[model samples]
Structure formats: structure tokens, C-alpha cells
Target: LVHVASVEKGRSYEDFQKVYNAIALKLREDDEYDNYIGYGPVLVKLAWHISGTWDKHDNTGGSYGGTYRFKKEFNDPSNAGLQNGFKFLEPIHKEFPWISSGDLFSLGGVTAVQEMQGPKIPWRCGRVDTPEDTTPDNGRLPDADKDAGYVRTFFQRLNMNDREVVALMGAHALGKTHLKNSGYEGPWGAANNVFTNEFYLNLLNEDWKLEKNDANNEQWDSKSGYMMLPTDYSLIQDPKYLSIVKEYANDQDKFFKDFSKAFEKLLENGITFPKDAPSPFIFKTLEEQGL
Candidate 1:
């Protein structure tokens, strides 16, 4: 017995651009989240987490299906506190009912990253929603409690190499681990909302100390009142990860290039695009378009 599944088509680039604009507009409007740090960083993290679930071997999970729409996926323990990102997008989805759940979810991430002054990730369309049966099991996302070896090994399942893991974890520079969320708390840098290589810079330049957070978790503390997770600090411990971290800290352009490539790879995990498909789209920011 061969049972077939139909792939639900998504919006074309032009139509999806409108959805992008809607998300961009809301991001501009909602400047109050996280104490006016804005929804940009957390949203970027949200998109990363959702897409990060994909494993390269079986192609079982990833952002392609927008499975987070399911309650079970939403309630996954690793997904703690991401409901805020999902809730933030609900109105936009309501307003633009034409976009697929997968497209909307992934696009929000693209918009957030670009708007936050990060690289322009060329996002593709055509992700179809899958049923609960397709939802990945819990425990797929990286554990904040782990070490560099664990981090390196875990990301291998997703096909990310050492450089990619270091580049991706640079995102930790943007947002903090909320105690209520990851059972860890503290921001990684001063400019938590704006995306920059400041994370790498802070990691390399700051004089950090081992301290117990309010949650009683061990994090690398700085006199500036910022912190980094053990997994994040692990980058400095490993020579390979440390070299790339220094590279990104020294050269912003290189960081942008690598981060953009790695982020696009993260978002596109588990989905195959045709050879004839369009190239990645770099949507103009509000400042660029004078909107």
C-alpha cells in the first residue's frame, strides 16, 4: 500500500514580500518587548530554535513544515518561553491568511535578523504544513546545560561543522537565557536587540568570572553585568571554536557572511529546493525603502 501526501503550496516571492512587510511593520511597531529591547532578538532566536530541530539524516524535523503550530510541538520542554514569539506572530498570520504557517514562521526570523542589522538571509518559499505524526520528538534543541563537546556532537546530527556551530552560537550574543525559560538567566551583551559581532567581541574582550546566577546556575559573568552560558563560554575553551570566535570579533564582514550562510542553512534544513528555483531575496529594510 502506497500512501501519498500532497505538499501544500505557499506564496510566491511577490506575495510573500507583503507578508514580510507585515512582519517588518509589526517588528517596528512592537518596540516594547523585553523592556524595549524589542522583539527582534528573541524572534531571531525563536526562528532559529524552530528550524534548528532538523536532523540531516532522516529529514524528520525542521522549519520546512512549521510543525510548531501543533500544541505538542509548542509545549515541548525545549520550547520553553518561545510561545511569546509564536504569540507575537499570531496577529500577523490572522491578517495575512494566505501565507503558509511554515512560510510565516520562517519569514518572521528572516525579517527579524535583517531588521536587526544582520545579514540578509535569502529565504525560500514552499514549506507545507505537516500533521502531528510528523512532529519531532522533544529533546532535539541544544541543551544550555551542556559543554563544548556535547554542543559539537549534537550539532553534527544537523550536519553543522565546528565553524558553523561557533557561528550559530554567536547568536547567544544577542539574547539572554531566561531563568523561567531555559532555567538560565542573563543577557550576553549590551546591545541585545541589535545583531552584531558584539557577542564575539564581548566574549574575547571582557573579563569574565564564574558566578552563580539568580537561578543558581553557573554562567560566565562580567563586570558589565552581562553573562554567557557554559555552552557559549565553551567556544573560547576549544582552540578551533576560539579561532573562529576571534575571526568574527575582528572582522565584522566575515561574521556577517558566515552567519548569513549558516542561518540560511538552519532555516532551510530538511527542505529541498529545485535547481530552477529563484535566488535568495534580500528584502529592503524600512530605512532602505524610506517606509
Candidate 2:
């Protein structure tokens, strides 16, 4: 389970920065995706799904392997809608042929978050593509229909604690769950492209009622057209998770900082960086660069 580093040859900050700019620019131009919600959220989810397969017990599957490029992983039932993100990255990969699939996949999430005005997520590169057989099986990602205990236990396999779990779930703010994709429907808030503590606020303030979608799966739906998976609503149901959710809702800066950390940890799970490896790179946001 110990994956030796296979750093891309001669890649420096400038090279990754160029890739970042490419992803950021495309995110701007791809405005028609998902009814104008854009490709940002899907890209983020793609990154998460790619990395979420890690099992800390043995460190088998993770971003380090980038096996999502293989058909088996890409076609996993849980990965139904991520093809959009993969297709979006295809041209970029064609342009920068040297970047490994793992690096591009994880970097796409970093670029999407920054371009969406989320946070300064410090990222590192060195993920090497492994063979298709190295890909983890499906069903490792969290189920959208679970409860608080399930959410807690599910993340334990990744070594994420309650605060980390809540912070990561804040990402639900970015995109709607398509019924065809996850058996759930609707956005969490109105600002689907922008990153904020809106998910927490909606969770705290919304008058959510249990309802069944067309798929017959239960989810909490608000009158305002927002929806939360049972797993999302479980945050408030558990006292410990609820406390963190309330904290995040009260202070966006705290949520952003925590999310940045948890996300970086999530993406880096199961990868071994050398002692001389470069420090994490903090890329500039599009707005910061006046682009």
C-alpha cells in the first residue's frame, strides 16, 4: 500500500501554474454545463471521487494512483455523472501530455475551487498513474442515503474526524445532485457556482421535510427548491457534527480554512511525498490575477 513517488520529470511551479490557468480559463468558458452551474462543481466532485477511494488501513486506492482514467473506475455506478469532468480535462491533457492523470485530476479540483472563489488550497504534485488493476472497486464513496453514524463510520476509513467530515461536506454547497446521477435532485443553495457557507446556513435555516424523490429515495427537501441527502441532514442530527456545522455557518473564514486543510488531506491521502519534495503550491485565483 506504500506508493513510491513517481514525480513527473522536470515539472516546476510554472508548469503546474500553466495547467491551472488552462483549467481556470475553461471553467470560465464552459458556462453552459449543468444549466449554467458550470463545470466547477462536477470537477470538484470528480477530484473527490478519484481520491475518495483511499483506504487508510492499507492505503490501496487514492489520488496517487489516478486510476479514474481507466474504464472500470470511470464507469463505476457511483461515478455516473463525472464523465463531464473527465471530458473537460481531456483537451487539457492532450495539450499538456506530460502531466499524469492523477495530477490533472487532483489539480482540476484545486483550480475549480480557487476559480470559484473558494479558498487558497495548498496543493502538491507527484501523483503517478498506476495500472487499471490498481483501481479500487466501486462503493467506496459515501452513500447519499445514510445517517449520522454511517457518515461518521464511512469517513473513518479515510481517517477523517468529525470536523473534517463536516468541513468536507460543506462542498455540497457547489452543485445540485442530479436524480439520474445520485437518485437525489436539487441544489443546496442558489449560488451553485460560488463557494460559501451557504450549505451550512441552508441546513440551519431551511424548513426541511422528509420527502421521496421520483427515484423513491428519501431526502430532505426545502420549500425553496433546495434538497439535502439524508447523509447531509445527519450532520445536524448528530450533536458533534451539528456543532461544527453551526460553527461553519457562523464564520465562513473558519469554514474555508478548515475545508482547505481537509480537502488537501483528502487529495493527498495514501501518497508518500519524499523529504525533499516541494512545499505545497498556492495558486492565484482568477480574480486575483485580474483574469
Candidate 3:
């Protein structure tokens, strides 16, 4: 189950940069989603959902194989709201059919984060598509209803320590949970499109009450109209996760740095990049390019 990177033929950093630019431009144009929260959030979720399938134990279900394009993975219940992100990328895929699905999916996340004023995620290309048989089963993703210990144990399968788990969960700042998608609803903070430590701040500062949603599932609800899954709130309930949460809540720069590293590692899991492979590409933000 060892997956080795096979670089796309005749492609270079400039080529992937073009793909990144296309994703960024579309993020600007596709403004009607989720009350103008834009496609950036879902795009990042799409990337995470695609990569979250990896199991460090067996090297299975990772971004290395673009199996998400298959119906089995596409139709995963955990992927309910991600169709929008996939559909948005359809034209870009059509235009750059040469790029592998794994690369496009991971790069979409990197693009979305940067466009939304988040940290720069360095990306590498060489993930080739595998047959549908390689697709992992649907339940590999984490459950939103779980507790702190469950969150810790679940991510251990991915080899992420407490700090990495907290940093990655910071991504909850970008998107809301759809009731239909995860039987939960509500944004984690006011700025749904912006990446910030607000999720940590709200988790620590808000007076959240445990309440059942229309679906009868428990979630932490706040007077500010924010919601946290039991798993998200567990960061504070656990002393170890709580410390990292407090540190991130106080220093935005530290969170950004940790998140960027953890995210890049998450995306790169299960792939063996060759020694001669190109250095990770760090794309310039639209603002950096004066767009």
C-alpha cells in the first residue's frame, strides 16, 4: 500500500501556479454561495475531506489517490455539502485535464486558504489517480458528535499529535456545518470566509450551552449564533487541548504558522515524494500579485 509520487509529465511550478491562480480567481467570482461566504470555505473542506481519509497505520485512503472522483467516495455521506466545491472545479479540471485529481483537490485548499487571508500552504504535485478499488470506505472520517478522547484517539490513526489536531481543527473557522451534511448547523464565528483564531477564542470565551438541533443531535450553541460540535468544544474540556487552544486564541501568528505546517503535512500524508522532486511550491497571494 505504499504510494509513490509520479510527477506529471511536462509540468513545472509555473503550471501548478496557473492552476492555483484559476482556483483563486474563481473564489472571487463565485460569491453567491452560503450568503456570500463564497466557495473558499467549502473548497478547503473539500480538500480536507479528501485528505482526511488517510490512515497512517496501513497507508490507505489518502490524497495520494484521487479516488474521491469516483462515485463511491463522491457520494460519501460525510461529503454531502462538498458537491458545490467539486462542481466549481469542474471547469478548471476540464481546462487542465492534465493535472491529477489529488493535486487539484489539495491545491484547491491551499488556494482557498490564501485567498481568504489565511496562511500560505506550501504544496507539492505528483499525486496520480488510482482505480476505484483503491478508494477507502466511507467511515474513515471523524464523527462530529464525539468527545475529546475520541478526537484524540481518532487522529492518532493519522499520526497527528495534540497540537496538530488543534491546529487542524482551527480550519473549522472557515465553514459552517450543514444539518444535512453532518446533522449540525451554524457557523463557528462571524467571519466564515476569513481564517482566524476566532474559533479558539469563541471556544474559550463563549458561554456555550449544550442543545439539540432539529435533527436531535447535541451541539454546543452560543447566544452569538455560533455552534461547536461536542468534538470542537472538547478542545477546552481536555486540559492538554485546552492549553493549545488558549495559546492559539491569544497569538494569531503562532496559530497561522502551526496551521500552515500541520495542513501541509496532512495533505502530504501517504505519499513518498522522490529525492529529486521539485521543492514545495509556495504560490503568491492575489494581493501579493497586486490583483
Candidate 3 lDDT over 98-139, as tens digits, reads 999999999999999999999889999999999999999998
Candidate 3 clash pair list: none
> Could you give candidate 2's per-residue lDDT for residues 30-94 as a string of tens digits?
89998889999999999999999999998899899889988888899999999999999999999
Q: What is the lDDT of residue 226 in candidate 3?
A: 97
| Reference-based lDDT, each prediction | 0.82, 0.93, 0.93
* Model 1 bad stretches (over 4 Å): 1-10
Q: Give the clashing pairs for model 2.
A: none
In model 3, what lDDT does residue 12 have? 92
TM-score of 3: 0.99
Which 10 consecutive residues of model 2 have the lowest summed lDDT? 1-10
Q: Per-prediction TM-score, please? A: 0.94, 0.98, 0.99
